[PDB]
Design an enzyme around this catalytic site. Structure first.
Site, PDB file in Angstrom:
ATOM      1  N   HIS A 113       0.860  -0.936  -0.295  1.00  0.00           N
ATOM      2  CA  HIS A 113      -0.228  -0.361  -0.181  1.00  0.00           C
ATOM      3  C   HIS A 113       0.813   1.112   0.188  1.00  0.00           C
ATOM      4  CE1 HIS A 113       1.137  -0.921   4.089  1.00  0.00           C
ATOM      5  NE2 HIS A 113       0.715   0.773   4.680  1.00  0.00           N
TER       6      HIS A 113
ATOM      7  N   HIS B  51       2.279   4.023   1.169  1.00  0.00           N
ATOM      8  CA  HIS B  51       1.905   4.566   2.746  1.00  0.00           C
ATOM      9  C   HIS B  51       3.605   5.226   2.080  1.00  0.00           C
ATOM     10  CE1 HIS B  51      -1.451   3.997   5.478  1.00  0.00           C
ATOM     11  NE2 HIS B  51      -1.693   4.970   4.506  1.00  0.00           N
TER      12      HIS B  51
ATOM     13  N   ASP C  84       5.474   4.515   5.174  1.00  0.00           N
ATOM     14  CA  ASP C  84       6.643   3.459   5.813  1.00  0.00           C
ATOM     15  C   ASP C  84       6.822   2.068   4.474  1.00  0.00           C
ATOM     16  OD1 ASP C  84       4.185   3.071   5.958  1.00  0.00           O
ATOM     17  OD2 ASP C  84       5.111   1.575   7.726  1.00  0.00           O
ATOM     18  N   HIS C  85       6.004   1.946   3.524  1.00  0.00           N
ATOM     19  CA  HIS C  85       5.978   1.580   2.330  1.00  0.00           C
ATOM     20  C   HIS C  85       6.619   1.624   0.636  1.00  0.00           C
ATOM     21  CE1 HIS C  85       4.541  -0.960   6.099  1.00  0.00           C
ATOM     22  NE2 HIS C  85       4.419   0.057   5.652  1.00  0.00           N
TER      23      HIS C  85
ATOM     24  N   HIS D  65      -6.702  -1.194   5.139  1.00  0.00           N
ATOM     25  CA  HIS D  65      -5.813  -1.108   5.576  1.00  0.00           C
ATOM     26  C   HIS D  65      -6.076   0.843   5.079  1.00  0.00           C
ATOM     27  CE1 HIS D  65      -2.399   0.499   8.199  1.00  0.00           C
ATOM     28  NE2 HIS D  65      -1.655   0.907   6.759  1.00  0.00           N
TER      29      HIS D  65
ATOM     30  N   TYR E 234      -7.930   4.586  13.210  1.00  0.00           N
ATOM     31  CA  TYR E 234      -8.936   4.475  12.584  1.00  0.00           C
ATOM     32  C   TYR E 234     -10.826   4.049  13.285  1.00  0.00           C
ATOM     33  CZ  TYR E 234      -5.168   3.362   8.399  1.00  0.00           C
ATOM     34  OH  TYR E 234      -5.244   2.810   7.475  1.00  0.00           O
TER      35      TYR E 234
ATOM     36  N   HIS F  17       5.146  -5.538   7.172  1.00  0.00           N
ATOM     37  CA  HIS F  17       6.569  -5.464   8.771  1.00  0.00           C
ATOM     38  C   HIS F  17       5.811  -6.861   9.133  1.00  0.00           C
ATOM     39  CE1 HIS F  17       5.463  -1.392   9.891  1.00  0.00           C
ATOM     40  NE2 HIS F  17       4.906  -1.164   9.063  1.00  0.00           N
TER      41      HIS F  17
END
Ligand SMILES: CO[C@@](NC(=O)[C@H](C(=O)O)c1ccc(O)cc1)(C(=O)O)[C@@H]1NC(C(=O)O)=C(CSc2nnnn2C)CO1
Ligand SMILES: CO[C@@](NC(=O)[C@H](C(=O)O)c1ccc(O)cc1)(C(=O)O)[C@@H]1NC(C(=O)O)=C(CSc2nnnn2C)CO1
Ligand SMILES: CO[C@@](NC(=O)[C@H](C(=O)O)c1ccc(O)cc1)(C(=O)O)[C@@H]1NC(C(=O)O)=C(CSc2nnnn2C)CO1
Ligand SMILES: CO[C@@](NC(=O)[C@H](C(=O)O)c1ccc(O)cc1)(C(=O)O)[C@@H]1NC(C(=O)O)=C(CSc2nnnn2C)CO1
Ligand SMILES: [Zn+2]
Ligand SMILES: [Zn+2]
Ligand SMILES: [Zn+2]
Ligand SMILES: [Zn+2]
Ligand SMILES: [Zn+2]
Ligand SMILES: [Zn+2]
Ligand SMILES: [Zn+2]
Ligand SMILES: [Zn+2]
Lengths: 264, 264, 264, 264
Positions: B82, B84, B86-87, B158, B189, B223
């Site tokens: 996805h 984001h 951190d990815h 997510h 969320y 993760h």
């Protein structure tokens, strides 16, 4: 030994000090902070915003617009000096909340599209929320909003898409030629022999000459200190303001001295 | 009282701790950090990268690729879990330096285009350099690179464009079904009654069922802690790893308990 | 009385007449049609394509590349003269099938992004499948692919993002300076007093001077007839070819005569 | 034997036959052509346009808006059924002339961005001027303009981003539930085993069920013939109009019969 953390774009406390709408002309107002220019032009057919400041100034800009009787839906157009984080920040948020359009040249549009990332000099240092330009403008193209004509003037140097905007307003009927010239500074730029900007010196020298020949009775800049403006005093703000000749000539002396030390 | 300064996206020190390429299969390698998965698949006709981590991991990813004999020009495709920070961070930089293409669905593409800004839950909190997707993929569409077929599986929750990728590799000739499922977490969320995501609970519940039915012999996650992976120990990394059934069932129990406390 | 139907962009039959790869230099080949230039440069680290022709020429370009031993994945970069339908057509399709990247300036990028629509002179008349530029280049920026350096030269006039590309090749060891200058024509353009292009005459006059000073031993143009090339004869193609001085001087005489009749 | 020429998207003469604004509700009007629906919703805080028809209908849409007392600057938002040339055509031109914004889901946005090119079923056959979406909407997200709330309903099938819009109006005070459902047809689509749309049958079957459960008192479709509307007769237009149950049930019978012959 882990990798270094991300570092936020931190500025002076005065760049984020809110102020009440300061009157520049009959239809021109300053609704930004103390050391960041954000101009609002009120017309009979809508409002025009020139620059917006830091990305966190979106709520402040909308606060001053309602003090001027301007609704979010009344903001018709957003114009920019150059697409950096300290001037084109809240553009992405103001488009979502005001139903406004953004007009800029091709270079400012491609820089605004990637949120200032991959800057020719700063890289990914000053990333801001990306926005999209709805109308591509050329050098000398006239943009009319509510009877007020905004004429663009390309002055490349600080950014490849730096644009000076000139428009005529009034001061109790008497016309006033306002020129909003962009920054003529190169803080930390490699001037001579830059592979990302091979013709940087030529564009800067040609921009000094373009700023002098601007039809101007009152000069403003994205940073008020660059044109000897003092938004804090209020009524005496435009007292010690510089001319276009004084602005371009002073910016050229700093440029040549900086270029001279670069060779050393 | 000035406006608050910008705040950088700071993460744990372990998310940025570099590690040597860890072998997952004959053609699958982990070239990210200790607590951030970045998978490299080596084929006879190029290399494929799945996720990239934090934006400052671009140099580390290119370091491990050359340790695997992969040149920058050999990276043909970039796939994402996805979009984001951190990815999908270094995607903008890896496209400039590797000549690679990015394939993602429409929701991941529109999120990657604005650098994660205007997140449905985080807003402008985790902005990263924006990148563009070169190929739009649909649910169940097969992507073939060098004889290895990557099948996409939409698991929205997510993010609206969360995608699980499944491919078959080998372990000394013996085939191994690898499934790279995205995060099934909702940290902070608003689940019930979200105006930005009205059908969030339905997509999450439907994603729990999609993750269980994934063809999987070895499960990995963006993760490693979410799938009980430990990239640090090395050889015993996949020792206590969870199944797709265990991953979806454990993520659903946390989801219902979180949804239960939200109503309270 | 219904509204008029859509009208397709129909060209001469010779613009779409396929031809075998014609050799221009040791590493430079012509793989387009008879009256549409599409140059292929073969290097040890990949292939470079300059222009692509009409949108329906994508299959023909890939046919000639395989005749030159170039695989689709070997095409690393795509360079463009200007982003019009008869030159930047198959760019959207070649990116999907070759894994290649596109480098262009900001003006050619914004025109390529909207598929030539809203042309400053043609409007929505010559719309082609839109493509995206992966790297923004500036005036004089060098682009290196496999030891061959491509230097850009901005020559605005036909389009705001018109670019002439210069590179040095060999002819059995002996070096040859090749210059690929863009079109210096204005068919049906309103030259004087154009509100969409206010500085059109200045850019044209400045482009005539830029084309003369191009380092050139062999000049090619997107239309071979503009530089007195004849791709049909084959070996005697570059026989009656014009110089950069002859090309710019002949294009300027037609420009001033056209400008003179416009005032009449 | 030259390459084939480009072919324009030619439609029936009735798709381009202009008509006067037809009244559907107190605030809902039909301002398109005879066989192409283009709905206008007039509010106290602006106007909303649903679909626009063929790209050459931009002048006709603006003509009817001024007949309804709507200025170009009064059009605040543009909503779309699906991003095809016969429905999302003049969107690029209406954004330049009305200062309006476009709201669509991610799939309709990525299709609108490339002007319908690279269609999953038509390819580059129906290319139109590309436009950009200013606001990404999700399934069930409410869009409020001037007190009128537009609720989106994803019904994927015809296109991946097909959206049905539902809103409540009045008929002389009495409320009326209007549902604007998208096309449930698959003309020439490969239903079973499509590599570009692997889950096409599932989305179609799930869309038939979504159209039945739509809150609807008066159903309209982008093609009036699909819902038994006759814009030509005027007052008796909604006489023989079908229900949501009748529309979805009739479209499903044609779908299963088409799917049955595909296997043969
Ligand atoms: C990107 O913003 C500027 N730089 C910085 O904020 C920081 C820095 O360079 O120190 C980084 C810049 O443009 O250089 C800003 N803007 C101007 C200007 O606009 O003239 C002046 C003067 C420097 O500060
Ligand atoms: C945006 O990145 C995540 N959040 C954060 O980094 C911070 C936070 O939310 O605390 C903000 C997120 O996605 O929520 C990251 N990612 C995952 C995940 O991917 O599951 C888990 C678990 C939370 O941390
Ligand atoms: C858009 O393509 C050109 N025009 C046309 O194809 C048609 C036209 O104008 O008649 C429309 C153009 O650019 O003007 C093409 N290109 C060149 C050129 O590139 O010089 C020359 C010469 C004219 O034909
Ligand atoms: C792209 O436009 C449609 N097709 C065509 O115009 C042509 C074709 O397919 O024959 C090509 C389509 O969408 O298939 C249009 N639209 C609808 C619809 O919207 O239902 C119906 C019915 C077919 O005609
Ligand atoms: Zn700056
Ligand atoms: Zn600045
Ligand atoms: Zn995340
Ligand atoms: Zn995460
Ligand atoms: Zn042309
Ligand atoms: Zn041409
Ligand atoms: Zn259609
Ligand atoms: Zn249709």
């Amino acid at each position: 030994a882990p990798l270094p953390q991300l570092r936020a774009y931190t500025v002076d406390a005065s760049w984020l000090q809110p102020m009440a709408p300061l009157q520049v002309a009959d239809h021109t107002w300053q609704i930004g902070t103390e050391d960041l220019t954000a101009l609002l032009v009120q017309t009979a057919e809508g409002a025009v915003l020139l620059d917006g400041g830091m990305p966190q100034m979106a709520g402040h800009l909308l606060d001053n617009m309602k003090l001027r009787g301007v609704a979010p839906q009344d903001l018709r157009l957003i114009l920019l000096s150059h697409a950096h984080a300290d001037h084109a920040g809240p553009v992405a948020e103001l488009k979502r909340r005001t139903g406004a359009h953004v007009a800029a040249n091709a270079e400012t549009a491609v820089l605004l599209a990637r949120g200032g990332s991959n800057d020719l000099h700063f890289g990914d240092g000053i990333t801001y929320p990306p926005a999209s330009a709805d109308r591509i403008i050329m050098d000398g193209e006239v943009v009319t909003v509510g009877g007020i004509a905004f004429t663009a003037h390309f002055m490349p140097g600080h950014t490849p898409g730096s644009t000076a905007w000139t428009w005529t307003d009034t001061r109790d009927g008497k016309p006033v030629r306002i020129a909003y010239a962009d920054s003529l500074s190169a803080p930390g730029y490699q001037l001579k022999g830059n592979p990302r900007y091979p013709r940087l010196i030529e564009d800067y020298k040609r921009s000094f000459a373009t700023v002098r020949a601007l039809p101007c009775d009152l000069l403003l800049t994205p940073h008020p200190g660059a044109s000897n403006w003092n938004y804090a005093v209020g009524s005496k703000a435009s007292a010690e303001a510089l001319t276009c000749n004084a602005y371009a000539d002073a910016a050229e002396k700093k440029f040549d001295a900086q270029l001279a030390r670069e060779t050393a």
